[PDB]
């Protein structure tokens, strides 16, 4: 670590702001160095090639860098980790926040959003139909398991196949192969209301201590008066959510649902949504998170709660609806699945061989990935059917499709108090040109909004891509990060290497199917930044390797600061946070004795 | 003594006396959630 | 003979109406996924 | 007097 | 020193395993024990009313807790109703009907972080067979003690092999004993602790519907309330006698085993779930120690044939002999991973001894008694269950079944489906299913009606089929999950303090 | 007047011959005091 | 026909050569064998010699166990 | 007479079924091309 | 007898199919794209 710091810190003078590109590329380098140890000969150094190509491109991107540095610096970065154990290589994920953070800007942040939120996409109708069929099948199977095999209230169409009608009458399960096969019987399906919308699941979601964007009439009140040429409107309306909630003369949860059902959201003339730069992200340009007005924020949080509480539990691949123990156990089982558990015409002559429990065992090969700008690639066509299905389930209409119809005719601005506009007088928001930090008429989604529906659609797409060729997979998906273990039955008389080489063929054959499915749904599975492994997969920024979790001990030690997370300077809270940080470091792979002494 | 047929037969034929028993035990004998223990099955069958 | 041909002619109509129902459902799904609020 | 306001001790804002 | 009288936990680690990278298939590999999966506390709720507002459920929870803790007499119920009327306006009778009975686990309440990096516990084999403390009851929970001890042993083995790459040359066995003489203390309990103060200044000024719920039930009629009251009085475990409680334990155990098999069949990576370690809780050990063998086996056979009824009917499999052969050919053809629960529960020394004393199982499948093959024991139990159920059905004794679900109407639909499957099985068994009506593309209600008509016609026309009885089922509907019913039966068993059922010239 | 009612309820719960500070805590959590505390706990910083 | 996340095709480009050197250095062979492989890889006429060297190294790795 | 009319009716019904199948097949294989955002100008 | 029943039933089914076709035409004619 000391050598790594010494090597990288030399780049800051010569390479001013591009150093954070290398600092971000550090983690893919660790993943590649771990990947170069797997048994399969094709997967050795397959991601390291792309990582090194990216580093060479970075190091040959300027005249100062060319005449002061060279591509030989990649060798210096690499040589400090060659011939080292797995734990030492995997430990450098704790070196993420120890290099500082880059200086952000509003125009640079909005340029990428404009670039990747204005493009027109081509979608396949059949693929969406099959994904919807898998969606309905998973819901039906979940309700069956929950209520002991009884189907939920369903009204099949007239053109339903005899197999589906027989399954409904007999109250039997449906496999995804049947769902893809008889996918035309799910086209006109129509659920009935069996879940009652509860508006009092959590009373504290309407009073979160957050900030709200001002109404569109006075949008520039975010910038302080010290940075604006003119003077803002004298109307004194609070932008924080707490005071707005306190000063609400009329309020009942029914009105939020009535607002989102009765068509009011599209007729509101005072709706404003504004981005805000994200802190402590060391990408060369920081991330963005959006905030809306009061009513729309309440509607959004209600929709998220409704979708997550009830429908989310029907899927077994959601990581956001499982407790600590259940999620840990499932992840450990999936990781262990990656290692074999047993090393070793006349007068037809047959010899009795001592078969060992059918002589076939299941082994899996792992594929972990994240999509390119997951939130920006969605469209209304992709999610309209699933929103309608959820509406039918809940007995209401057009609540879960509130995002795109509202956003398609709105303007977004990156609101930073120290990046004011150059206006001399107040100007209506929709009058500024399509440049600077304005996004006009967006199409895609927003980071952190209706993410549960996107997760369900992604799970359905993964299952369709698996069924499309015949392989079997088990997945774990949260937002963008998805880890899929492709399982295959192989003879148990073989050896380790041959079994792994057998499963690698299924993985490389399923990767193209997943790419085609995601391209059909409008997304794009980037070809060179997908982690195919035989032992490891990454989830929640942690690596699972042959059933064991590689340690990250120094990350919980780097946050043992004196005045740590204290509202006011007090000894009790600081000592509590120190003890918590040291306990976390101990349970991440630090020695208990030295951890206690250092604490 | 694998199954203990010798022990039971000798107990039946010869005089009754205390019998000390030893047998092999390896990694295969372990069960998923059961303590490692050994006892002749044939002796149990004969006794019952 | 006559009864058999009548039964076959009747049975063709169920297939035709199933095709019509499938077309209607396809158009309905297209309308749902295309038309805005 | 409201003298219970302390300046922030850790980074919590973008640079 | 203790002569084996001191409870302990047994932990074992093999000899020559490379901890770092497993380049060879390891037979001792297993999923570690991350802690007890705590069950939801919302499962202890009677599903009489389809939709209830949150204040009503809060009042029900308050009444449940108060009656569990401070007594269950009439005065305690009046005080609980007085306190619960703050959040919902429930009549005393409706509250008495709708509040379940609480246990120790209900009160015991307690991004994601791993408990520890898992290094050498993938191979550790652990057992609590020799560990048991008598002080456990409903007042004091002892699952936490067991969880703490297993986790501490796991952490000790994790720390010992922290800096060495290989496991070693010899197997490592460790006993985790406890110092029960000082720390472990028996707890007394006085159930009736009357209050001293009096609720006098409590008013009811609140009116918001999300804070207060006046008239919590709207759609419920008076006839519906009377029906619900009668049904609740029917299944009240308090007024049942000992034999009924033991029978309920056995029926719930059989249903749990069957449902676990059915749900575990679907799962993809089942072979890896079966090797996973877990605590002795929710492992059915205690009821297996205190259930009735004959009723459990008969119910298991009935559940098996009920599951296979439609497949038997579609294939026209007739006769008491061909059905058994087909069922067991199917059972042996499929993966043996689905028998995990039964195979594990039958391996306990006390469970195996109790089953063996009755002649159902004998130590025949291996050289040593303590390591009998699990799959063979499970198949033998299944064979005995099927044979017993079919022989008893032909002999003419009814079958008792419990249908448990959290919703009443779903429970009724499940009862109808169960009756339809049983009628299909009866048609198969009586060797009259070859000429029966076709049951393709029909709902279960239509199948039930058609099979009822066919069976009545065949019985009336021909008087040979006397052993075939349509009303051979006694189905009891419960408005809760099966786990809640089993726990309630076990709790009443412990409270009543009734022992489990226990069952010369030839010697000389 | 919520404070007086809360103290009186807690005293009625605990002022008995045996004190159970956990059952009373659960009952208060399920009562109005639980939602009162949940709502009032949204402000956690001195600045806000 | 090019490389992707699924496979590494040995070629003569600088990134591929660096990746091959790194994967040879991280192998579990003897130090002399790794050094000899590195020197033999540094002198390659075209992609065919690189592919042959990679095949030989893969065979040696397989036979190492 | 009867056979001739049966054959003719079968032929016309087959033609109608073929047309319906053509319509269904052409509907199913559809590429949906969404429009692009930005300032209307 | 039988012929009249055949005529009535066939005419009724043909009219029902024609009504369904007209409904389909009306439904497609209401698409916002068209
Ligand atoms: Mg992303
Ligand atoms: Zn000991
Ligand atoms: Zn002590």
Residue numbers in the entry:
A (entry chain A): 266 to 609, 638 to 892
B (entry chain A): 1809 to 1856
C (entry chain C): 435 to 471
D (entry chain A): 10 to 24
E (entry chain A): 1182 to 1291, 1300 to 1692, 1707 to 1711
F (entry chain A): 1037 to 1084
G (entry chain B): 539 to 603
H (entry chain D): 435 to 475
Q: What do the authors report?
A:
The RNA polymerase complex of hPIV3, like other nsNSV members, consists of the large protein (L) and a co-factor protein, the phosphoprotein (P; or VP35 in the case of the filoviruses)4. L harbors five domains including the RNA dependent RNA polymerase (RdRp) domain, polyribonucleotidyltransferase (PRNTase) domain, connector domain (CD), methyltransferase (MTase) domain and the C-terminal domain (CTD), and possesses enzymatic activities required for RNA synthesis, cap addition and cap methylation. The P protein consists of an N-terminal domain (NTD), central oligomerization domain (OD) and C-terminal X domain (XD). Here, we report the cryo-electron microscopy (cryo-EM) structures of hPIV3 L–P polymerase in monomeric and incomplete dimeric forms.
In addition to this L–P structure with one L–P copy bound with CD′ of the second copy, another main class (class 2) of particles lacking density for the second CD domain was reconstructed to a 3.3 Å resolution structure representing the monomeric L–P complex. Since these two structures show nearly the same arrangement except for the second CD domain, we used the 2.7 Å structure for further analysis.
